[PDB]
Design a protein around this ligand. Structure first.
Ligand code: NA
Lengths: 48, 49
């Protein structure tokens, strides 16, 4: 929340997302890179 | 035949010499070092209702 002369965290949602198998093989192990996006199933929903 | 003459008898041991003294036996320290601290913080709670 951006108030006048101050900013405050209304919330901080912190999650740990698994890296998909194809990203571990093709990106991390082959090129040493990760996608900047996290696409995973959390709480029976696909979240990106 | 003759009788065997007296044998050389064994000798009692001299006996272990002992030094008297005072002792302190020390062991490896496994107890953590302990001290007193004070934590100053603030519980911040933002409730969205
Ligand atoms: Na004799």
């Amino acid at each position: 929340w951006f108030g006048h002369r101050y900013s405050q965290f209304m919330g901080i949602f912190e999650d740990r997302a698994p890296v998909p198998f194809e990203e571990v093989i093709d990106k991390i192990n082959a090129k040493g890179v990760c996608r900047s996006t996290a696409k995973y199933v959390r709480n029976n929903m696909e979240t990106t | 035949v003759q009788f065997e003459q007296p044998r050389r008898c064994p000798t009692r041991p001299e006996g272990q010499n002992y030094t008297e003294g005072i002792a302190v036996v020390f062991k490896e320290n496994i107890a953590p070092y302990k001290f007193k601290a004070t934590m100053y913080y603030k519980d911040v709670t933002v409730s969205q209702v």
